[PDB]
Design a protein around this ligand. Structure first.
Ligand SMILES: *[C@@H]1O[C@H](CO)[C@@H](O[C@@H]2O[C@H](CO)[C@@H](O[C@@H]3O[C@H](CO[C@H]4O[C@H](CO)[C@@H](O)[C@H](O)[C@@H]4O)[C@@H](O)[C@H](O[C@H]4O[C@H](CO)[C@@H](O)[C@H](O)[C@@H]4O[C@H]4O[C@H](CO)[C@@H](O)[C@H](O)[C@@H]4O[C@H]4O[C@H](CO)[C@@H](O)[C@H](O)[C@@H]4O)[C@@H]3O)[C@H](O)[C@H]2NC(C)=O)[C@H](O)[C@H]1NC(C)=O
Ligand SMILES: *[C@@H]1O[C@H](CO)[C@@H](O[C@@H]2O[C@H](CO)[C@@H](O[C@@H]3O[C@H](CO)[C@@H](O)[C@H](O[C@H]4O[C@H](CO)[C@@H](O)[C@H](O)[C@@H]4O)[C@@H]3O)[C@H](O)[C@H]2NC(C)=O)[C@H](O)[C@H]1NC(C)=O
Ligand SMILES: CCCCCCCCCCCCO[C@@H]1O[C@H](CO)[C@@H](O[C@H]2O[C@H](CO)[C@@H](O)[C@H](O)[C@H]2O)[C@H](O)[C@H]1O
Ligand SMILES: CCCCCCCCCCCCO[C@@H]1O[C@H](CO)[C@@H](O[C@H]2O[C@H](CO)[C@@H](O)[C@H](O)[C@H]2O)[C@H](O)[C@H]1O
Ligand SMILES: CCCCCCCCCCCCO[C@@H]1O[C@H](CO)[C@@H](O[C@H]2O[C@H](CO)[C@@H](O)[C@H](O)[C@H]2O)[C@H](O)[C@H]1O
Ligand SMILES: *[C@@H]1O[C@H](CO)[C@@H](O[C@@H]2O[C@H](CO)[C@@H](O)[C@H](O)[C@H]2NC(C)=O)[C@H](O)[C@H]1NC(C)=O
Ligand SMILES: *[C@@H]1O[C@H](CO)[C@@H](O[C@@H]2O[C@H](CO)[C@@H](O)[C@H](O)[C@H]2NC(C)=O)[C@H](O)[C@H]1NC(C)=O
Ligand SMILES: *[C@@H]1O[C@H](CO)[C@@H](O[C@@H]2O[C@H](CO)[C@@H](O)[C@H](O)[C@H]2NC(C)=O)[C@H](O)[C@H]1NC(C)=O
Ligand SMILES: *[C@@H]1O[C@H](CO)[C@@H](O[C@@H]2O[C@H](CO)[C@@H](O)[C@H](O)[C@H]2NC(C)=O)[C@H](O)[C@H]1NC(C)=O
Ligand SMILES: *[C@@H]1O[C@H](CO)[C@@H](O[C@@H]2O[C@H](CO)[C@@H](O)[C@H](O)[C@H]2NC(C)=O)[C@H](O)[C@H]1NC(C)=O
Ligand SMILES: *[C@@H]1O[C@H](CO)[C@@H](O[C@@H]2O[C@H](CO)[C@@H](O)[C@H](O)[C@H]2NC(C)=O)[C@H](O)[C@H]1NC(C)=O
Ligand SMILES: *[C@@H]1O[C@H](CO)[C@@H](O)[C@H](O)[C@H]1NC(C)=O
Ligand SMILES: *[C@@H]1O[C@H](CO)[C@@H](O)[C@H](O)[C@H]1NC(C)=O
Ligand SMILES: *[C@@H]1O[C@H](CO)[C@@H](O)[C@H](O)[C@H]1NC(C)=O
Ligand SMILES: *[C@@H]1O[C@H](CO)[C@@H](O)[C@H](O)[C@H]1NC(C)=O
Ligand SMILES: *[C@@H]1O[C@H](CO)[C@@H](O)[C@H](O)[C@H]1NC(C)=O
Ligand SMILES: *[C@@H]1O[C@H](CO)[C@@H](O)[C@H](O)[C@H]1NC(C)=O
Ligand SMILES: *[C@@H]1O[C@H](CO)[C@@H](O)[C@H](O)[C@H]1NC(C)=O
Ligand SMILES: *[C@@H]1O[C@H](CO)[C@@H](O)[C@H](O)[C@H]1NC(C)=O
Ligand SMILES: *[C@@H]1O[C@H](CO)[C@@H](O)[C@H](O)[C@H]1NC(C)=O
Ligand SMILES: *[C@@H]1O[C@H](CO)[C@@H](O)[C@H](O)[C@H]1NC(C)=O
Ligand SMILES: *[C@@H]1O[C@H](CO)[C@@H](O)[C@H](O)[C@H]1NC(C)=O
Ligand SMILES: *[C@@H]1O[C@H](CO)[C@@H](O)[C@H](O)[C@H]1NC(C)=O
Ligand SMILES: *[C@@H]1O[C@H](CO)[C@@H](O)[C@H](O)[C@H]1NC(C)=O
Ligand SMILES: *[C@@H]1O[C@H](CO)[C@@H](O)[C@H](O)[C@H]1NC(C)=O
Ligand SMILES: *[C@@H]1O[C@H](CO)[C@@H](O)[C@H](O)[C@H]1NC(C)=O
Ligand SMILES: *[C@@H]1O[C@H](CO)[C@@H](O)[C@H](O)[C@H]1NC(C)=O
Lengths: 287, 138, 100, 97, 130, 135, 52
């Protein structure tokens, strides 16, 4: 027998903008950092350095794209626990950012249709997006050299992972990314031709990301909502199977916040010192 | 801390082989012995830096006395009378001292350390008994 | 020669740690924005003079999926998040401790 | 393998179990390695499967370590062996419709 | 800090020694107000270290430099205490024992100094021959 | 540690006292000590001075092992004195000279002496280990 | 041959340039300075060779 526990709380609105936070080891500990520009998700690094503190990471919460964070030094790097595992998240870190500009117009004042204040949209530059995918495809082809690369929309599930999701100033946005992932690829592009506009809605009843449950928020702010973000990466899931006869499909993944933090913390390890060691020598203790 | 990136682990740089670290250490020891915009948060960091230094000292002193259990109190390098088993390591003296780093070496014998530590304790106990038994005559 | 055990203290060797890290940020500490407000009481100021030491010829095995810094960061963010963006209604499941 | 039976049009519950008694990332797949369901963080994701419309899960039990696959309105062609992936153990059940 | 052996004489002396052996094996085998309190706590830790180091060297005067437990060659006087080794070590705690012989310590300290002086004198004379 | 030095290091005695006098004073203090008979800115600065002195102290206590004097404040060696370094007698220097005067007097022989001390320690260890080849 | 700290009773808020410089260049003075008179030591000083 399961019984939902319901808590009623005050509903103030607050300014809400992620600040970079650095982590620092306590006395007795140190953090090792991997300095390779080509570093994998796991394995050896030959350029290793010691720091007391990590770089700052903004505590950004998002589900399909990584909206604010660091860039790869040289090339797009694709990291996965197991590239051949259909169930794993593939984290793609970009070496260039793609600007995304989201807004809620002051003229959107309709409250109901029949018995719009929740209408918003986001812009992506077309040339940045197609360039980004062409580079991603070229890297995907290193793992899938004889297969067609198809991008597609989500296969289904809760709206937080089906659509793109983010929060600006307390406003929870759900955006349609079908326009970004409907592209198909060969070594060439299959799309047409400036501005890719995504349709976004602002919602009040959302699922929790911090646990299992639902949460309801107060209705939208009257106006002037703007977000200006740098996409630095993607969360993709590969759809494989025994019948995938020469084609691989890449769909937006995510929903697991640990993956978002791994995309920034992958370079750091915390260690302790064990100064007592033993080795054979040719000396003898006098007794 | 003549050598090393850490307060503890002062016998050498990571990546140096064990023998190389020893030679470097001797030279540095000789030289040392022979004598050859304020920010408000700086207060916070100053305290943290001192805490790290104080802690390393407290640990150091503690370990220096604890090692007395094997007859190695107060020492950095302590010779014992426990024979080395080829079972623990089949490598010879020069190959490990010249080609292996300390981390590699410890990995090589990592799961024998508890056994070795036990043997060291036993040896020290017998050595102490022998001295005191002789003093019952003398 | 006869090989004998020698004990060395001050050996430059390390193992993986499982500890608590401190957070630092340049909180405004006058602003009402949530992250600055949280950081004001949760974190210390950043380091005005950080240092980095490049290690010598070493190899270190990193693994982003076994990295316990992630779990710790996750907990800090949830705590922050829930001290600010409070829902009007919070609904979570709760089950009886029965073997069914 | 575990065997679960039902008739065309029925609903069955196939299950995976963790010893953790916590919500664990898990997945369900068919014999052709097509994803059906899984746990991403706190969210339910569905794969490009013939069961996308039929498949469901009791999200409220994920913190009990119970990760069911509920298949509604069973088709005779849904009689496959389903594969659980929980933690790092695998489980298999054959469904006969 | 040392704070003795941290047992507050809540156990007898023999028990304390056994406990130390066990711990040595285990150890080797393996917010504005925070500024003010951080400094005071740190000062206390530094002070403890300085006193320790000083005393470990001062004990050289009795030939016990650098040791925690120092065995000497001064015989025990039954007049100081008429108890046996087991009676003292197994049944008394450190704060009971020191009270029992609290005012004989100045005499003992004097004897320890004298013994060390004679030992040094003897060794150096032998070394004028050898 | 011991309030004769007027400095954290240099604790064996006050500047200006003869070497002999300093040793006598130090003995007396040891007996007495063993017998039992903006504030935040400056607090940090004071601690840094104390921590640093401790670190140097410990460092040197171990570095002196190279001459066979590890862990010691006063250490006797087996290297003979060269009258060439100094023509003075033991009471002549210990009774009338201060430490600074003494160090100035033999300042340019310091590296010669240090070299000899290292050599002696090496020979001593070598001899002991050779004896232990059989024993 | 070392680097010394500067200290002053700077106000900062007065905007005067020495106070403004001192605000970050220096620290507060010692509220309780101490002086130890040494024993009969003779020391050679030379103001023209003083690197301070
Ligand atoms: C990736 O990182 C980037 C970082 O660069 C993130 O981008 C940032 O996202 C922020 C999210 O809100 C956004 O913040 C807004 O900026 C607006 C502009 O600020 C600048 O101009 C003002 C003008 O006076 C200056 O004071 C200020 O210093 C800057 O120069 C602010 O105006 C926004 O504040 C308002 O909205 C927040 C929403 O939570 C309220 O909490 C806050 O109190 C303000 O509310 C006003 O507007 C509402 C509208 O209905 C009113 O109801 C309310 O009473 C207030 O209205 C008064 O003020 C308005 C001002 O015109 C006036 O018209 C009205 O009559 C009232 O007087 C908020 O601060 C960042 O700017 C943005 N950064 C950039 C570069 O764009 C990005 O999101 C990150 N990505 C992710 C995924 O996180
Ligand atoms: C992005 O992914 C989606 C999902 O995979 C993909 O679209 C799918 O394409 C397949 C192509 O075969 C569609 O499958 C068929 O579509 C026809 C259209 O009229 C249907 O009639 C078929 O149904 C009959 O056959 C089935 C075979 O088992 C029977 O079960 C069924 O009862 C009918 O007899 C069948 O659906 C599939 O439906 C679509 N899915 C969606 C959601 O559209 C899409 O093309 C991918 N995008 C890109 C860019 O590749
Ligand atoms: C600071 C250091 C704390 C002291 C810890 C006690 O260290 C103790 O040393 C003595 C030898 O001198 C040993 O005596 C045996 C003890 O087994 C050991 O535990
Ligand atoms: C950072 C702070 C620095 C550490 C603080 C503590 C430093 C030590 C301060 C006092 C040290 C004095 O410790 C000193 O030890 C030496 C021998 O080892 C003793 O010197 C001794 O020389 C020989 C024997 O060794 C004899 O002449 C006589 O027994 C005694 O004079 C002194 O009796 C003692 O005073
Ligand atoms: C943690 C607190 C901060 C400081 C910690 C304490 C400082 C110690 C750091 C340096 C330690 C090195 O101190 C070390 O001492 C040992 C003996 O004890 C000496 O041992 C020496 O033995 C012989 C010389 O006789 C040589 O074969 C060998 O190369 C050399 O190491 C080293 O010459 C000296 O370098
Ligand atoms: C390891 O990576 C570091 C970090 O990039 C390299 O050192 C940097 O080199 C640039 C060149 O201009 C300097 O500006 C940085 O300040 C350097 N950083 C540090 C911490 O020194 C380093 O050379 C790399 N080492 C190896 C062996 O590849
Ligand atoms: C990225 O991760 C893979 C998976 O571990 C690494 O592949 C292993 O590399 C080591 C290197 O010696 C090989 O011994 C293993 O056999 C490899 N595993 C497999 C499954 O082939 C890969 O090297 C990593 N890439 C980088 C740059 O480190
Ligand atoms: C997103 O891009 C769209 C592209 O259409 C912008 O809409 C256009 O804005 C220009 C500005 O002069 C108008 O002339 C066009 O007619 C608009 N197009 C349409 C279809 O209405 C939109 O304003 C951009 N939004 C953001 C947030 O930048
Ligand atoms: C999102 O808004 C930013 C800010 O206006 C746009 O970037 C600016 O574009 C103008 C065009 O001349 C440049 O002069 C500015 O220097 C740009 N700013 C920066 C920070 O580079 C950006 O292009 C918009 N993005 C989209 C997709 O419309
Ligand atoms: C994103 O927008 C597209 C349209 O721009 C939605 O897909 C359409 O859904 C209707 C529903 O009957 C279909 O008739 C259209 O053919 C669909 N168009 C395309 C291009 O697929 C899509 O569902 C939206 N996705 C999300 C996640 O909101
Ligand atoms: C998105 O990336 C741009 C650069 O591609 C960032 O803007 C630059 O930030 C650096 C930081 O020191 C400044 O020196 C540059 O002058 C900035 N460039 C421009 C054109 O303004 C931008 O801040 C990033 N945005 C986010 C949200 O991280
Ligand atoms: C991709 O391009 C090559 C170029 O010749 C073509 O042969 C191949 O068929 C293309 N892929 C698909 C799926 O058509
Ligand atoms: C991406 O867009 C640019 C815009 O000019 C175009 O030239 C380029 O060829 C496109 N990418 C591919 C792979 O065609
Ligand atoms: C790394 O290898 C180079 C090769 O000459 C060597 O000089 C250097 O000292 C090595 N570093 C370490 C820590 O041994
Ligand atoms: C070490 O050598 C002795 C010699 O008999 C042997 O008994 C002992 O088992 C050896 N140790 C190991 C780990 O083999
Ligand atoms: C172990 O030592 C024996 C001694 O002869 C040698 O023959 C053998 O090859 C060694 N094994 C390894 C793995 O080195
Ligand atoms: C160290 O490794 C090199 C690698 O070629 C080898 O030649 C050398 O003999 C090794 N050193 C010892 C002492 O075995
Ligand atoms: C140490 O661990 C390795 C891991 O496989 C094992 O093979 C080896 O026998 C272990 N050695 C000991 C002494 O247990
Ligand atoms: C120790 O016992 C002897 C026994 O005759 C006695 O003469 C001597 O005074 C005692 N010493 C002390 C300090 O009580
Ligand atoms: C004191 O010592 C003498 C020595 O023989 C003993 O006979 C006497 O009983 C002791 N007294 C006590 C109270 O133990
Ligand atoms: C400790 O006191 C008890 C109380 O009767 C006594 O029986 C026991 O023998 C005493 N132990 C020692 C060592 O004196
Ligand atoms: C210790 O103090 C007590 C207090 O009465 C006294 O009786 C005893 O004789 C004193 N012992 C010494 C050695 O002075
Ligand atoms: C300084 O001179 C006076 C004169 O009597 C003397 O007593 C004192 O001990 C001297 N101090 C030193 C350090 O020599
Ligand atoms: C030290 O005495 C020896 C004795 O023969 C002499 O040869 C040597 O040169 C003397 N040292 C100096 C610096 O004169
Ligand atoms: C050294 O002392 C002797 C003792 O008579 C003296 O003759 C000699 O001249 C002294 N050396 C110097 C340089 O004065
Ligand atoms: C110390 O100087 C005085 C000054 O008259 C002198 O008489 C005395 O003999 C000197 N002491 C020594 C040991 O040379
Ligand atoms: C030591 O320095 C003094 C200073 O003038 C000089 O006269 C003396 O000859 C020097 N001794 C040596 C050995 O250089």
């Amino acid at each position: 027998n399961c019984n939902t526990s319901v808590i009623t709380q005050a509903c103030p609105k607050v300014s809400f903008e992620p600040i970079p936070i650095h982590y620092c080891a306590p006395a007795g500990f140190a953090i090792l950092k991997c300095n390779s520009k080509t570093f994998n998700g796991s394995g050896p690094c030959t350029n290793v350095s010691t720091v007391q503190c990590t770089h700052g990471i903004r505590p950004v919460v998002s589900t399909q794209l990584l909206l604010n964070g660091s860039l790869a030094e040289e090339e797009i790097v694709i990291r996965s626990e197991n590239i051949t595992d259909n169930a794993k998240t593939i984290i793609v870190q970009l070496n260039e950012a793609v600007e995304i500009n989201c807004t809620r117009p002051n003229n959107n004042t309709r409250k109901s249709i029949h018995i719009n204040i929740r209408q918003a949209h986001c812009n992506i530059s077309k040339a940045r997006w197609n360039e980004t995918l062409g580079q991603i495809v070229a890297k995907l082809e290193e793992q899938f050299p004889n297969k067609t690369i198809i991008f597609n929309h989500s296969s289904g599930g809760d709206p937080e992972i089906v659509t793109h999701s983010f929060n600006c100033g307390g406003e929870f946005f759900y955006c349609n990314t079908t326009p970004l992932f409907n592209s198909t690829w060969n070594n060439t592009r299959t799309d047409d031709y400036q501005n890719i506009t995504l349709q976004c809605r602002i919602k009040q009843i959302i699922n929790m990301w911090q646990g299992v449950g639902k949460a309801m928020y107060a209705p939208p702010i009257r106006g002037q909502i703007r977000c200006s973000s740098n996409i630095t990466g993607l969360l993709l899931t590969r759809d494989g199977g025994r019948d995938q006869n020469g084609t691989e499909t890449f769909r937006p993944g995510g929903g697991n916040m640990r993956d978002n933090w791994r995309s920034e913390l992958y370079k750091y390890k915390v260690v302790k010192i064990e100064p007592l060691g033993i080795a054979p020598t040719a000396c003898k203790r006098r007794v | 801390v003549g050598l090393g990136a850490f307060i503890l682990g002062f016998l050498g740089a990571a990546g140096s082989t064990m023998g190389a670290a020893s030679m470097a250490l001797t030279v540095q020891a000789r030289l040392l012995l022979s004598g050859i915009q304020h920010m408000l948060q700086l207060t916070v960091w100053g305290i943290k830096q001192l805490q790290a230094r104080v802690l390393a000292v407290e640990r150091y002193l503690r370990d220096q006395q604890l090692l007395g259990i094997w007859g190695c109190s107060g020492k950095i390098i302590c010779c014992t009378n426990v024979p080395w088993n080829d079972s623990w390591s089949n490598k010879t003296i020069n190959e490990i001292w010249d080609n292996m780093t300390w981390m590699q070496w410890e990995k090589e014998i990592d799961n024998y350390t508890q056994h070795i530590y036990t043997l060291l304790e036993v040896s020290q106990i017998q050595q102490e008994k022998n001295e005191q038994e002789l003093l019952e005559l003398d | 020669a006869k090989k004998w055990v020698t004990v060395y203290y001050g050996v430059p060797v390390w193992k993986e740690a499982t500890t608590t890290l401190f957070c630092a940020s340049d909180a405004k500490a006058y602003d009402t924005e949530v992250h600055n407000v949280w950081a004001t009481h949760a974190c210390v100021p950043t380091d005005p003079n950080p240092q980095e030491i490049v290690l010598g010829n070493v190899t270190e095995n990193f693994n982003m999926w076994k990295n316990n810094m992630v779990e710790q960061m996750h907990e800090d963010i949830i705590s922050l998040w829930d001290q600010s963006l409070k829902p009007c209604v919070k609904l979570t499941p709760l089950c009886v401790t029965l073997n069914c | 393998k575990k065997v679960v039976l039902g008739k065309k049009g029925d609903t069955v519950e196939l299950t995976c179990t963790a010893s953790q008694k916590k919500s664990i990332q898990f997945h369900w797949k068919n014999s052709n390695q097509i994803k059906i369901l899984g746990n991403q963080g706190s969210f339910l994701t569905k794969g490009p499967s013939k069961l996308n419309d039929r498949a469901d899960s009791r999200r409220s039990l994920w913190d009990q370590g119970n990760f069911p696959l509920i298949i509604k309105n069973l088709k005779i062609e849904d009689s496959d062996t389903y594969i659980c992936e929980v933690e790092d153990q695998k489980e298999e059940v054959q469904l006969l419709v």
